[PDB]
Design a protein around this ligand. Sequence first.
Ligand SMILES: CCCCCCCCCCCCCCCC(=O)OC[C@H](COP(=O)(O)OCCN)OC(=O)CCCCCCCCCCCCCCC
Ligand code: HEC
Ligand code: HEM
Ligand code: HEM
Ligand SMILES: COc1c(O)c(C)c(C/C=C(/C)CC/C=C(\C)CC/C=C(\C)CC/C=C(\C)CC/C=C(\C)CCC=C(C)C)c(O)c1OC
Lengths: 57, 75, 93, 247, 385
Amino acid sequence: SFSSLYKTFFKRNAVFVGTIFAGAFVFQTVFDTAITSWYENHNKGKLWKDVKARIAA
Amino acid sequence: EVTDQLEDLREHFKNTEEGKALVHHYEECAERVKIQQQQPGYADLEHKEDCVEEFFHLQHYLDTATAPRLFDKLK
Amino acid sequence: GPPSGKTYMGWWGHMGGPKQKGITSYAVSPYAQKPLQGIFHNAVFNSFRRFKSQFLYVLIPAGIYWYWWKNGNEYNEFLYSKAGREELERVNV
Amino acid sequence: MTAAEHGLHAPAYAWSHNGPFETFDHASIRRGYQVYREVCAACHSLDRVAWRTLVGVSHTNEEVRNMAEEFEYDDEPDEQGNPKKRPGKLSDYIPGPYPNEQAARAANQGALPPDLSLIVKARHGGCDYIFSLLTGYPDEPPAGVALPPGSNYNPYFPGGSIAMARVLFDDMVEYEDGTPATTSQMAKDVTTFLNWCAEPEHDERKRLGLKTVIILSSLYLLSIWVKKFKWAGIKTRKFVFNPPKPR
Amino acid sequence: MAFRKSNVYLSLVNSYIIDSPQPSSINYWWNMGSLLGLCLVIQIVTGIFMAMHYSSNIELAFSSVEHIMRDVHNGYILRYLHANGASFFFMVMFMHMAKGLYYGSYRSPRVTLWNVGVIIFILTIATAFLGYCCVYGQMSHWGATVITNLFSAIPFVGNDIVSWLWGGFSVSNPTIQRFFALHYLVPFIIAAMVIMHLMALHIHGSSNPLGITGNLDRIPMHSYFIFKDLVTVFLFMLILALFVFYSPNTLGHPDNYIPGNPLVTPASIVPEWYLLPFYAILRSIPDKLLGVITMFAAILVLLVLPFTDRSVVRGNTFKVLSKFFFFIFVFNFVLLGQIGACHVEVPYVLMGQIATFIYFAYFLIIVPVISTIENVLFYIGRVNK
Ligand SMILES: CCCCCCCCCCCCCCCC(=O)OC[C@H](COP(=O)(O)OCCN)OC(=O)CCCCCCCCCCCCCCC
Ligand code: HEC
Ligand code: HEM
Ligand code: HEM
Ligand SMILES: COc1c(O)c(C)c(C/C=C(/C)CC/C=C(\C)CC/C=C(\C)CC/C=C(\C)CC/C=C(\C)CCC=C(C)C)c(O)c1OC
């Protein structure tokens, strides 16, 4: 219910502030990983790791 | 086998209709200088005409035609 | 602390305006409203009204100073070309 | 001034590192070092680049160890105070061909070859100017110009006359990966390498700019909603006037 | 009473950023003052952390900046933030001063507030010049030569002032270590003169776009303009991040990556872009002494404004002719900068001399004459005589 949602997270400021901090910890690690993955994939074949393995054939 | 891609591309656009106009204009400047350098007085007349401007007009045209295409023939 | 001079602004309760009588004000709580009401309508029709009233005070001076700049750039380029050597000596010297 | 003393403007090429999501082509960086060592290094220096910065970018750790160990560096004096020499290590810097500036001008008809660690950033045109200068030597100077002896012609150099002669000729370097080494191919590879020398943070800077713009754009949109919510009562406010009776 | 009003330190916070009575009609142009406060904080913090890795010797100054970019962790972020942040500092300040010129914020009750701002403008120009010299590139060395050589035109004592400023016979090691020490100090004088700026604003409060009294309708600063300032704060860092991570050298000069050499002239010598309009005014007078005097006049004529405005209405909101000629001055300023980055050629010399005349004629001729004409038009347009 919307009354139970307010009573758990939005009634006490301590829980509201703690939830923001715990949501920033999770966002921090996930956002970094998803950005390097897209950045590396957009530049496939131009990285040192790509060319190092090619000359290793 | 493989020669200079830029040299092969520059010789192509020099034979188009627009290119042949800029080439033909540069040669007209050369003859006006090639005959004015063999007269008494050319050794010292202060103002000596050159053909840098005609060379610049032609060279600019080959650069716009070749720049967007050259790097696709390289590695 | 000592007193200060006479200013033209006060604080809450003694701001320093005329006496007010006969004006009534009404307001509704922000928690009971729609914050984004009419954004699409204002972005087109209100934006066109605001632009149409001020665009003549900005563009005319801008166009005067841009035509001046371009006319001075072309003249300088012509002056330092092969066809402008007869004018460069008669002006800069 | 005239267009001759201005210098011809370089055109725009489609470099692979152009673009907000693009990085350096690390195969051209590896090829570009070979061109520098075999052609450029005879007269130009790279004294702002250390050996260790090449590891993980274009060479393995063991390869750079063998590259630096071919040069002699000054060591600490011995027990009797006599000078000594040692082979290079990863913490050193790439050495130059001349001991001082007087030596450089003596070997180049009085002209000084500049250092090539920031040359891409120090010229108006960047990568397009270096490439156009290396491939823009005409076989003949235009009819009328009078070159001083010991100088060459290049339309891209301000003034026209440049003390460096053409140095890139077809099939002068044998690449290890089998790429046909032509004048245009070598000029393209050495320019990418020199760009990495000037901006070694290029790859990681563009990745950090993606995170920064994404996060900052969300905050700008969120703050617009919050401002409009807090101003709702003042934006919709009504006033009525009823004139008072005289008293 | 509340603890925020009774405490000695909190009462200064409450009276300035919490309970301050603000007019309800001020638009987003009234947001540039809070942005200038964030710019000053950014420049001080990045400068201090960069100063832990910098050497002011003339033989190590250029290489220490290259050391920051390459060896210091996140050092290129600090340098590009400090270099581009200074460019954004002058962007906001130019718009901050044009807001008060449009809305008549210099008029009678707030003359002291306007005068303090002119002092802050002079100090900020000096601070940016001193920090540019600390890089010691080809444009910073030759820029310092021309600027400091203009003091030699002062009669009698002119030549001695240059030697005292240089510390020697030319721009050398004593000059470069001199300028880094002053570049550390002057920003703290600006911070102390900003507090005097806010003290003179608090006596009568802010103005409004309508130009009339705001004592009839006020709202507190907190939760109304705290969140309206947060909107432009986030937009400010978004545009700055674009220039720092995707185009860090668009606003600079490539010749400042060549180490300073006193033996080779770097062809055309120009200062940074925000000093270009004042550089063109100096070059328009064919006399060193007179030309130098005119350059500081261009900043001192701003003090004549409260006395050459003969209008009984404050601002340009309801004035037809004043609105038109205001944008003539604005775009005249932009053309002056373009001439400052040009060569000394046939058309450009006369273009900068006429544009210099328009700059001074605006305060001393155009504003007094226009403001008297509009006063009559307002009168005869409604009186039945
Ligand atoms: C390079 C170094 C930087 C500069 C030096 C910095 C210090 C010099 C002081 C600044 C110059 C004065 C401002 C111009 C005033 C003006 O011109 O306005 C004119 C006003 C008019 O006053 P009026 O409107 O009340 O009456 C109208 C009647 N004419 O006269 C003044 O206010 C006189 C003020 C002089 C006070 C001396 C300064 C003492 C400062 C102590 C306060 C410390 C504050 C806390 C720390 C921040
Ligand atoms: C092998 C590829 C190679 C590259 C790339 C290279 N050099 Fe130079 N270089 C010079 C000299 C001398 C100058 C200075 C020209 C001048 O000042 O007129 C110069 C100038 C330059 C410039 C500056 C251009 C400018 O606008 O100032 C660049 C860039 C450059 N060289 C790069 C001697 C050489 C020599 C010795 C023959 C060789 C080999 C040489 N240079 C090989 C190379
Ligand atoms: C670091 C430099 C400066 C800072 C931090 C600063 C700060 C501020 C602030 C916070 C305000 C109130 C908010 C606002 O009006 O936007 C303000 C108002 C004002 N400032 Fe500045 N300012 C600076 C420079 C200047 C300059 C250079 C001038 C003029 C030459 C100036 C003149 C004014 C005027 C006239 C006002 C009142 C305008 C009005 O309220 O209508 N300030 N300043
Ligand atoms: C309002 C405050 C300041 C302004 C406007 C300012 C301006 C500048 C400018 C324009 C440069 C030239 C940078 C470049 O072109 O690359 C510079 C350089 C520099 N400044 Fe500042 N500065 C300010 C405050 C400070 C402070 C407080 C310090 C030290 C405590 C500092 C330290 C430095 C250093 C070390 C450099 C070296 C060059 C560089 O790192 O780029 N600055 N400053
Ligand atoms: C919205 O309301 C506001 C508003 O909130 C503000 C702030 C301002 C701005 C007003 C001001 C007066 C500006 C305030 C700032 C200053 C006067 C100068 C700021 C000073 C500094 C940033 C100095 C602080 C420096 C440091 C802490 C040095 C950092 C170095 C460290 C920590 C070294 C590390 C430590 C060790 C031990 C190794 C407004 O104009 C305004 O509008 C009305």
